[PDB]
From a paper:
All classes of bacterial IgA1Ps cleave host IgA1 within the heavy-chain (HC) hinge region, the linker connecting the IgA1 constant fragment (Fc) to its antigen binding region (Fab), leaving the light chain (LC) intact while separating the Fc and Fab. The overall structure reveals that S. pneumoniae IgA1P is a multi-domain enzyme, broadly comprised of N-terminal (NTD; residues 665–1070), middle (MD; 1071–1611), and C-terminal domains (CTD; 1612–1963). The active site is formed between the MD and CTD domains that bifurcate the Zn-coordinating residues of the HEMTH motif (residues 1604–1608 in the MD) and a downstream E (E1628 in the CTD). We have determined the structure of a member of the M26 metalloprotease IgA1P subfamily of bacterial IgA1Ps both in isolation as well as in complex with its human IgA1 substrate and solved its structure with a neutralizing mAb that provides insight into blocking S. pneumoniae IgA1P activity.
Residue numbers in the entry:
A (entry chain B): 241 to 450
B (entry chain A): 242 to 450
C (entry chain P): 1435 to 1963
Amino acid sequence: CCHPRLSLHRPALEDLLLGSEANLTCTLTGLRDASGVTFTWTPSSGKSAVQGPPERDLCGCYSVSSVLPGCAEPWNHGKTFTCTAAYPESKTPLTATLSKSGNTFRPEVHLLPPPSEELALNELVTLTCLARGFSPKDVLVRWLQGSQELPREKYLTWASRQEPSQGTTTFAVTSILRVAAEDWKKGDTFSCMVGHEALPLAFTQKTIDR
Amino acid sequence: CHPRLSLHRPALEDLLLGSEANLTCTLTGLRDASGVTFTWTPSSGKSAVQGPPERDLCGCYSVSSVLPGCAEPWNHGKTFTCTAAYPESKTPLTATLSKSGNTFRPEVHLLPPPSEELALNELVTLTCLARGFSPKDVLVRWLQGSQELPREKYLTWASRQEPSQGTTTFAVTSILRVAAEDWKKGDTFSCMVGHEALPLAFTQKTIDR
Amino acid sequence: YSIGVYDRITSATWKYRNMVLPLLTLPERSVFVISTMSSLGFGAYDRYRSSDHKAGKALNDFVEENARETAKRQRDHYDYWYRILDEQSREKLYRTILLYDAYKFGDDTTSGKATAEAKFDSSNPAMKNFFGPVGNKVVHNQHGAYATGDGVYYMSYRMLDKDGAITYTHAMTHDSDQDIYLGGYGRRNGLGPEFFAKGLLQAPDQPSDATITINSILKHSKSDSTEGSRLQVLDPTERFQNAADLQNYVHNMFDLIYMMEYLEGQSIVNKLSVYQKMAALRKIENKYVKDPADGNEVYATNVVKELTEAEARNLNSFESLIDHNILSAREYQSGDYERNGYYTIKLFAPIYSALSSEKGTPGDLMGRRIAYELLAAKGFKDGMVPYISNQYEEDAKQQGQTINLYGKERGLVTDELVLKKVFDGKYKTWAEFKTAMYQERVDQFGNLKQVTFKDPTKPWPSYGTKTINNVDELQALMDQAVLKDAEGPRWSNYDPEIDSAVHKLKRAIFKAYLDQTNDFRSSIFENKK
């Protein structure tokens, strides 16, 4: 629309260990061409970088991004990111701080039975369990209470905002869940957690309701 | 280029506290000559100064102005359909700030839950989740004595959806962790929620036990 | 000497003396005559009739009051120019030159200023009873104003509007810059008529304009909303009482400008990467091209180009910025400039370059910059007039440096001669002069600086103050702002302008310092700074 320049890229390590498809495409903007642009990484564990799937953002055609989207042994080391899928016209350097595991935090779920004066029937309960566990925004943060996956509508990777706490502060994503009255009497409480980028899953499950 | 409308959502609580009312309407979609002409079709006599235009980082420069100067209409707000002439198109383009009363009663949730689970021996938490939405602006406002801090510096999470079937409700969670010492120190201890309709900014308890 | 109309038109050597007999017979008040010192403007009432102003009491009220205001503004401008010139050339600011209006009259149905050029047969009373009888066929194109040398004609800019005086000063500078504004000597051989007007010796186009100009006409009180981003002089007749006052004003303005430019330069060489340094700066040079007027190709035109990477890594020293002739790209385009063009130097855009032509003419972009800097070192007499008025031409001819002008041998005033004559023992090269100016400014702001600087540099929610007290915090803020521009440098729109943070901080500091004192008097806080 008006420049020659990009936007901040979200490094993709979430697909590599928390998903069946180990995609390694950090979000980039301002690239409108075929994915033949060279990809440069400061430290490479082994396999060459793979560009992410074409998408259109800000009226921009097929935008390239930078993959090794599944090198799990290399990913375990925690060496930085700072994704730089630079276009030929654009400056070659790329920089988003994401090297060795920094400011790692543990999940702090806060779920307790809630009074329902407005919901006498008890068919639906609105509980927003406390979250934490991921200092790194670009991670496949998912909640799986019990041994069975929860509601497709209620299951996703919700965005979180960092919250003002004593000492270290970690972003938390709300996980409100709606279930039937029989499910509540079931005792199958849903755990809530956030996972750091350095750890493959970084998910802790602990919840008690009623 | 293409025109776009973004809900500024100007803090209602800041406007009441502030000496001058704060309101803003903007239209995005200008890709033409550097000279820009902007005019407002409807004027109520209230101040309508226009601030320097702010880029969206995809070029497409878009202009803006203020709709301040209103103190008499505390609850009787004006319409939000801005129409200012621009260089790309002579005809005015409708701008919507979605002004709807949406009157409703707001109740927050406070729970003393799993003491061992939520305590790191010196860790304390407060639970005040915003419920009940009437206007287009919701804030996780917290009361901290007479101390004053810049609004821009503070960063907080957005709105949530908590509506019962057959009813319309909005959620905002007036939560930001802070020392619980003030609650037992005899200092004022009430989370602040900003709603133009019913901005009680304190916990509400139903008559039923 | 008379300001009276009859003593002007009646007097000999007048282009349209016969304009007295139609004037004495005009049936109704259809023409206005603004007869101030050194100008005799003639305008028609139908020039301002539109939908907003209807023929009758409204048009007569709008024209009379606006004509009085324009007369007052022209009088203030010439009062300023009379107070400035003290070389006894002020006695020649009594010439009379008419300022005819467009002849483009507008009916009550026309929305704005109509563009219907009258054909001398128009029924409009002004054309039939005055402007037509005093025949003066003017080219009358739709937009622009031109000065024929013996007069001034407004085709688009209306003479009574507030934008009429900003064009009035430009036209007057073209009309009388050969024996009036200069010491008495003609224009420089290389510089054209558009050099001494748009960039220098003109009032700014807008108050909030970030350009190095002298607000000599417009008098705007703090009551208007224009107080925000004033970035100019409050009152012209109050601030300027003599040449010393103008020299002091320019000296303080350029002291602040040099402080900000040195801070930005220290931010460039210290906290900036190579690829960012490539796009953040440009290299200015002088290219000699053949001109159709004179056969000699000694004239130089300024050209801005993108500096190579090999030059970028070598810019580590602050002194090198001045030596390698680099200029900021925030407000200056990357294309080559032309001679006699409407090019003005921006107030906050640094030009560390001291590029000088060892040949006769500097150019345009570099010419105005050095000329304003020379005004800081020395006043309008000496200083700026030697640089732009070839009064040292004869000296050149005696030493050498002849040039074939129109088939005759004439003196060629080179920048080396100007430097060796204005500052004989102080400096030897323009780079040395620039470095000495920067070093004097550094020794200044290292000790005495006002701690009362109030710069918000933040978004629409009102930010009250930053209260910088020593140059170190200001340098840190400049470093942070420069780092920010380098991040996300989309440069999408053709002109980033106000969006860049670096410009916001400079504008805020400039306005804060301008509003701290009454005007630019002294920028030195006499303490342990």
